[PDB]
Symmetry: C5
Subunit: 238 residues, 5 copies
Amino acid sequence: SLLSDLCNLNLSESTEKIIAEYIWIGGSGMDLRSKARTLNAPVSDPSKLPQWNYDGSSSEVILYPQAIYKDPFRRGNNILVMCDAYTPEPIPTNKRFDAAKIFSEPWYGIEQEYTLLQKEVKWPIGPYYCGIGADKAFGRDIVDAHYKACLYAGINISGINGEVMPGQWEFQVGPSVGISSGDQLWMARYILERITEIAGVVVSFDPKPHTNYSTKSMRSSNMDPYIVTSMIANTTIL
Amino acid sequence: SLLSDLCNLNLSESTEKIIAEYIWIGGSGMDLRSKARTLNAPVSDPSKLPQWNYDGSSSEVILYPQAIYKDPFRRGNNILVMCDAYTPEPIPTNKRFDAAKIFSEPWYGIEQEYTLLQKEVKWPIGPYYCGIGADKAFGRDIVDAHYKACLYAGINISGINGEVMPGQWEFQVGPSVGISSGDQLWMARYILERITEIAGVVVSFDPKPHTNYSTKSMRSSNMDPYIVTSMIANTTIL
Amino acid sequence: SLLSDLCNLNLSESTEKIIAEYIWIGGSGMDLRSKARTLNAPVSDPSKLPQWNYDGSSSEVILYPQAIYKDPFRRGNNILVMCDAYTPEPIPTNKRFDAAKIFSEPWYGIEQEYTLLQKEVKWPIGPYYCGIGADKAFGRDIVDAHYKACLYAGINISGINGEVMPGQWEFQVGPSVGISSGDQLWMARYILERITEIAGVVVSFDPKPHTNYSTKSMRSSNMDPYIVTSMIANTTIL
Amino acid sequence: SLLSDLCNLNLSESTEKIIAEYIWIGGSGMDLRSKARTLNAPVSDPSKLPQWNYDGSSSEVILYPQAIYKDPFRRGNNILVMCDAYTPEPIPTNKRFDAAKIFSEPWYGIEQEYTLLQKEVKWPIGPYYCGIGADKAFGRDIVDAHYKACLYAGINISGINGEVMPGQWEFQVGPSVGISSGDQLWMARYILERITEIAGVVVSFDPKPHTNYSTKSMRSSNMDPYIVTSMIANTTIL
Amino acid sequence: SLLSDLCNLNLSESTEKIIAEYIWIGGSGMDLRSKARTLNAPVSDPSKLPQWNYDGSSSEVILYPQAIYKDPFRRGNNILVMCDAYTPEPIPTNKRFDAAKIFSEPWYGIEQEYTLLQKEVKWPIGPYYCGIGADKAFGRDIVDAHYKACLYAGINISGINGEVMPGQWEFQVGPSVGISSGDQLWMARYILERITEIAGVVVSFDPKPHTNYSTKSMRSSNMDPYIVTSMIANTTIL
């Protein structure tokens, strides 16, 4: 148990403190980053978690709690929260205020693809449609881990399946509220981004390392979940 | 424990989702393929799962649920589902519609070999009938795993044998009622396909990498099984 | 983690089926073989099990349930059975019919010795009389495993000790009733090989790689657990 | 396995002998040292633990119980104790008597940074600001372990984050009352080294391999939690 | 999980038999040998256990159950026994008869030192006074294991500490009564070797690879836990 018997300890035995990691979109847009801080009492309602901030130079950017769900790598009562960047008005990189004001029942099953690479070499490991056996499932345990972690957290994920291109996969979100579909993707794009970090594997959400619409009824710019859903919710009723 | 901490979480606490993988026969060979997707509530009756499909060009091929049995590698309430390839007329590769219409009380204890060798070298890992000790059993952990997973799932499996020539094995399929011996010899043939894949072991069903009949009206080989189980039933129908 | 998370699943959770490992003696008398096959209800009475058989060419040879004890490598309700070989009259290699007819309450104890050697060079791994410390005891974990497995199964083993010969040990089968005594020894020998099979070690019982008598009063030449006891009983207790 | 089966035994059944490790500050640098000592009755009141001592030549140096917290690597009822060094008057290296006499309710939060390097080459293992995935976070397992151990012990650590230069972090000691605040820093720092000792990594706190103040009126070159805190409270809490 | 899944099985679920490790002192006085035996019912009274013996040629030498403690390497109801060598008159190497007749309430505390070295090269593995982290403490896992095992067994050990010379330590047993005091030391010594057996390390107690006295009335040349205590009791109490 070299650095493995730890990282997993009971919570309520000693203290009542619960961590709550703060997550936000950074960099060019594909880099989703986070850092940790505790709390006092376990509450899942987003209107009680205190605000916070960080320094953007490393530019004082404020963060507000929006999504409070559970945690893959810590269990019990530990919590992940999804927060957006506000410039010292929202920051232009946020790209969420417009979506919030537009969406303020458009269920969206956004479809996303991800490819696995061997991080020591940055290449994929090693009839291919959902193949099994040798030279087919390059880290199918990683996929099991991500699927079950997403079920545990609170992400509404709705299936996963491989294709012909080696290593790569894709998973489905299905029945998620429009604005929620801008959260439940990004967090689910985050959890996976950590899981392969355990191994010598990296997920690259890129083409070369679909948007469902089921409204309750009617009653009325590259790779951004929020931008795509906002654009396609424009024109169409809601 | 790299990546193995996950894959073995629980679902009775967080979300009542029960992943139900969908399985269908592949192309020319006996490559039983499958892909994963979810469900909502725990039900074992195959008359309630909705009819789903896939793309065959990677064309549209629809699948229906008929075999609903528990999971070796996921446990809990997760389920494997056996499905056959229909076209919205059964595909010739199906070879199950004729057997179903013929059988709708014969019991088939068909015998099958599952010669298994090493992955990288395609060679065995290491008076030989059911040998024990050095240079006798080139991996019995996977074999015990397959046996117990088969009993756990719901397969009515009965026996297992060793072999003299290094490598070959065999398991009995048990008292399977007619068309049921088209499920309990494929999905119980599917389970092994993952277990060897867990290790550096490849199972080579081919002869060069028996037919039973126990009816109640008192009247009386892997690869291709549907044809076999059905032709010898026609000869002695009910 | 890999390949070992299986092999340890539970029985009574899914199905109340039981398994059984049918064990017979090899041609030369030093090899002990077995093959596995299931059963419906768990019963420990040797009379209730049904009579089974095998092929002697690998020539039909029948086997009857003689000794029913529990299983260390599968735990739960899994059961080992010691059975003798019958020609379709006892088979000459059986050597048990004479002992059974002779013994049909002598308490007997027989001593066993065995040498452990490396798999591919045939030398022991790594004052020696019950020695401890550097260059004294090698593979004492195997010894602990065998001792505790033998207590668990039903073998009434009594003690083990190490001697001067490198990689040499000796265990005592303890007081036990009549022919069952000899029978018990066989399972003990059996168990050892499987445990040694885990470690990649070769066990040699041959001399170049004591018999205890105690009764009430009167019943109311190559390492043979049956010939030796029959000869030493013929003269005094039959 | 290799010693890991031990180190984790329970004590509430065999012997209720609470251990206690006596922690004292080292010599020139920041080398917080200790040794173990058993006790009879488990009590957390620092006014009942017996005084102890040691030899300073490796000179008698008495030690008195000040801080009683729980234990990362022993758990159960095992307790760590933080004690200051007294000459047979305070020792000059103690630096705590001045702080105690000054403080005899200013809340303090101090900032700590530490750089991780390889054991035998001194380079660190393996947009960086709180980065995720590969090439951003190296050995976050150590960091998660230290964070959760610090919550478990009794340290009221409050937050943690990464930085831009490769291979360092920063954790927030949290708001606490009086001199205990400074004490807690030392204690928490202690835990880190033990955890790093598991991984074969060297922790360097040196700059080249801030303080928060709030009162009861408000709310909640040496790297000395004592000198800096006392100097800040000299000018305000007096 | 090879070879280690066993060795930790349960006792009371299958059989109520217990084990017992009979331990005697080697000829040279520095080696402490033992061998295993079985018992029917678990009893901790040294009077009820049966006398046993061995062969001194590897010359019969009788042994009696003197000290009964629990077992760290088996848990459950398994028991270790410390026994002395009696020739059917005590053997001169015993050295315990004189101490027993001298002592037949002086509390004694003895100090022990040991050095850890590599199995092959004989050099130690890997300011040192009670050092922490890298370059100070090597193999503290062995030390924590021995401390906790000694608490578990019944040895009322007091404390342990590091020292200056690389790779050597010292533990202390002080709350001991009568001749059992010396006895306890011996048993504690024994445990250490078995633990080091797991790690592939060599323990040397030799100087070149303290006695505490307190009575019920208080204050009103080899390393032999018996010779030293008998000599220092002669001048005071007995």
